[PDB]
Every structure is written in structure tokens, then in C-alpha cells.
Design a protein around this ligand. Structure first.
Ligand SMILES: Nc1nc2c(ncn2[C@@H]2O[C@H](COP(=O)(O)OP(=O)(O)NP(=O)(O)O)[C@@H](O)[C@H]2O)c(=O)[nH]1
Ligand SMILES: [Mg+2]
Lengths: 135, 210
């Protein structure tokens, strides 16, 4: 098969995290609430991270899907956010965020679940530690 | 300007074409059977070591009633995916028909054959039985829109043929800086209401995916 478009140049591959340091990194499953259908819809499975920029001090939550490595959550952590358990669960949390996963600002109700309650508790710990030093 | 490719997704009804597209689009897994009416065009963007590439996926309907519209769908098509279901022998039996009608209109476009639903134990179409890719020098992949098994390889193979780079790599999507938070009071109540409904609704069943 012959190419259809001209060969685009190679780019300098960057993750976008080079100037940030990880406060937290752990595998999780993400959900997004569809208020039209009133049902939770799987949003992505992979590593959720809490990242602090090394100069500005701004902290964000970032998550990537496995395999595709596409972004399923990207938003700055604000002091108004509150991680709330879902249905009396000790392994999952719900919160609201202005997400940028699709590179469009979308207000979303998100839920994140971890394999164990210890992982979930560490996430809440670091998520709220970040809320205390937000810049 | 940007790199765009028209991809036509074809196959018998119930093979999971739409579920496959939505899994890439949003990460959701639709369990319901909502047959496509005609065609729906969805853009899927992948990030490569040569920049982003967009597949305008024409998710066509497998129902026969739309057979007369397919030549119009296939106009200007640069690549295709032929989908069948490994739990339905008849869906594989029809693969030659989808390929015949495609190549009549398109002739020499890169085409990938996908056997979907390999997550289901009771597999009916064994790898031994699948010989049509060797017959028409197509690329084949076992896939599962549910477990995501190989579900990105069709786009990677097609992107390599269309770009002409056999070693094109799908790389991590650059994580651009997100918007700043204004914390405005007015819009808060609407989100608080939407958040209570979400908190009350239980999450999907715990799976062994994690
Ligand atoms: N177990 C399993 N089920 C799947 C998979 N992909 C799709 N399904 C299921 O198969 C059913 C039909 O999927 P759908 O995408 O609507 O099929 P389609 O090929 O688009 N049909 P149509 O041509 O009529 O539009 C849905 O219930 C969906 O959940 C898969 O990989 N595994
Ligand atoms: Mg469909």
C-alpha cells in the first residue's frame, strides 16, 4: 500500500509531566456519571497521579488509560473538591471537577476505585495533602 | 491542517462495531444492543512519534436494509476495518461479502480483519478456521472491546500503512496544562445537585480488570 499523505516529521515526544513531581501514583479505574442516562460509565483504567509543578507549585490529578495511553482525567485540585465514598464503599470516591481529558473544559462527576481500601486511603491522604498546599 | 484518514467500519450486525468505537472514544463499555441506523461518523485521535493522527471512523450499520447505501459510505474511503464475532460463525462466513463490496469501490486500501469478543470463553470460530486474511493478504487481529485485548492494534497497523512508516509508534498523549479554577459560587449549586445524584447511584460491579 502506498502512503496517502506526506510523511509528517518526527516530533520531540514529551509526556507533559517532565516539569512535575509525583506525590502519588497507583493503578485505579475511573468512572464518569452520565446524568442523561443516570448511569456511571467506565472512563478509564490505569495509573492516576497527583503531580506538583516544580516551579509554580500547582498540583493536578492526571490519569492515563493503559494500552492507548490516552488521558482520562486532567484537572487542577481545588480546595472545594471533596472525596466522598460511593454507596458506603471503602475503596471508591466521588467528586466534581472541571476536567480537561479531551482538552475541552468539561464539568464532570467522577468516581475512582482502587483494588484495596489501603490504596484508596493513601489516595485520599495525598489528594487532601495537596489541597492543603495548593498554589 | 492536520493528518486525517477516512476509515469505514463494516461487518454483520451485533459484531460490536459501535461498542468498539465508543470504547476508544470515551472509555465506556456499552452492554446494550442499540443497532446503528445507517452510519455514524466518530473522530478518534491517536498520538504518535510523528504527531497526532485522526481516524474519522464511519461506523456503518450491519443490517441488510442499508445495503444500498454502502457504496455511498465507501466514497473517498482510505482504509477499512472488517469486523466479525468469534461466537457467531455466520458473521465470519459473511466476511468475504463485506470485502468483495469494499474492494469493488475502493480497490487498494489498507484493510484490517478483526475477530471481536474473544473475551467470551465459548469461542465458536477457532484461529484454525480463520483463513480469509491469508487469502486476501489482509492483517488480522483477535480483539475484545470488553477486555481491550489488542483493541488498539488495528489503528496502529492502518496508521503505519497510511503514513508509510512501518515503525510508527503510538506514544503517551501529551498532558497539557488544564484550566484554572475560578470557584465561582453561582454555578456551584447545579454541580452540587448533579453530584448528589451521582453519589447515590451505585458504581458498576467490581471486576477483575483491576
Ligand atoms: N462480550 C462482549 N460483548 C461485546 C463486545 N463488543 C460488543 N459486545 C456486545 O455486542 C452487542 C452489540 O454491539 P454493537 O456495538 O451494538 O454492535 P454493532 O456491530 O454496532 N451492530 P450494528 O451493525 O447493528 O450497528 C452489545 O450488547 C455489546 O455490549 C465484546 O468485545 N465482548
Ligand atoms: Mg452499531
Amino acid at each position: 500500500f502506498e502512503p496517502v499523505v506526506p510523511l509528517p516529521d518526527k516530533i520531540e515526544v514529551k509526556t507533559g509531566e517532565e516539569d512535575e513531581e509525583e506525590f502519588f501514583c497507583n493503578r485505579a479505574k475511573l468512572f464518569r456519571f452520565d446524568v442523561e442516562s443516570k448511569e456511571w460509565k467506565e472512563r478509564g483504567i490505569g495509573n492516576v497521579k497527583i503531580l506538583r509543578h516544580k516551579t509554580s507549585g500547582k498540583i493536578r490529578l492526571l490519569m492515563r488509560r493503559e494500552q492507548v495511553l490516552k488521558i482520562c482525567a486532567n484537572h487542577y485540585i481545588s480546595p472545594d473538591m471533596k472525596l466522598t465514598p460511593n454507596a458506603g464503599s471503602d475503596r471508591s470516591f466521588v467528586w466534581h471537577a472541571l476536567d480537561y481529558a479531551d482538552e475541552l473544559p468539561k464539568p464532570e462527576q467522577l468516581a475512582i476505585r482502587f483494588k484495596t481500601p489501603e490504596e484508596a486511603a493513601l489516595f485520599k491522604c495525598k489528594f487532601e495533602e495537596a489541597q492543603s498546599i495548593l498554589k | 491542517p492536520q493528518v486525517q484518514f477516512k476509515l469505514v467500519l463494516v461487518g454483520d450486525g451485533g459484531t460490536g462495531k459501535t461498542t468498539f468505537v465508543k470504547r476508544h472514544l470515551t472509555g465506556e463499555f456499552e452492554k446494550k444492543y442499540v443497532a446503528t441506523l445507517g452510519v455514524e461518523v466518530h473522530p478518534l485521535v491517536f498520538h504518535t512519534n510523528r504527531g497526532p493522527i485522526k481516524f474519522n471512523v464511519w461506523d456503518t450499520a450491519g443490517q441488510e436494509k442499508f445495503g444500498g447505501l454502502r457504496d455511498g459510505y465507501y466514497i473517498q474511503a482510505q482504509c477499512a476495518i472488517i469486523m466479525f464475532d468469534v461466537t457467531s460463525r455466520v458473521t465470519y462466513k459473511n466476511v468475504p461479502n463485506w470485502h468483495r463490496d469494499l474492494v469493488r469501490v475502493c480497490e487498494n486500501i489498507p484493510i484490517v480483519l478483526c475477530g471481536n469478543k474473544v473475551d467470551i470463553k465459548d469461542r465458536k470460530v477457532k484461529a484454525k478456521s480463520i483463513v480469509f486474511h491469508r487469502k486476501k493478504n489482509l492483517q488480522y487481529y483477535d480483539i475484545s472491546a470488553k477486555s481491550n485485548y489488542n483493541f488498539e492494534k488495528p489503528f496502529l497497523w492502518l496508521a503505519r500503512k497510511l503514513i508509510g512508516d512501518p515503525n510508527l509508534e503510538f506514544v503517551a498523549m501529551p498532558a497539557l496544562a488544564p484550566p484554572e479554577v475560578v470557584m465561582d459560587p453561582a454555578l456551584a449549586a447545579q454541580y452540587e445537585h448533579d453530584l448528589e445524584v451521582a453519589q447515590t447511584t451505585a458504581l458498576p460491579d467490581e471486576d477483575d480488570d483491576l
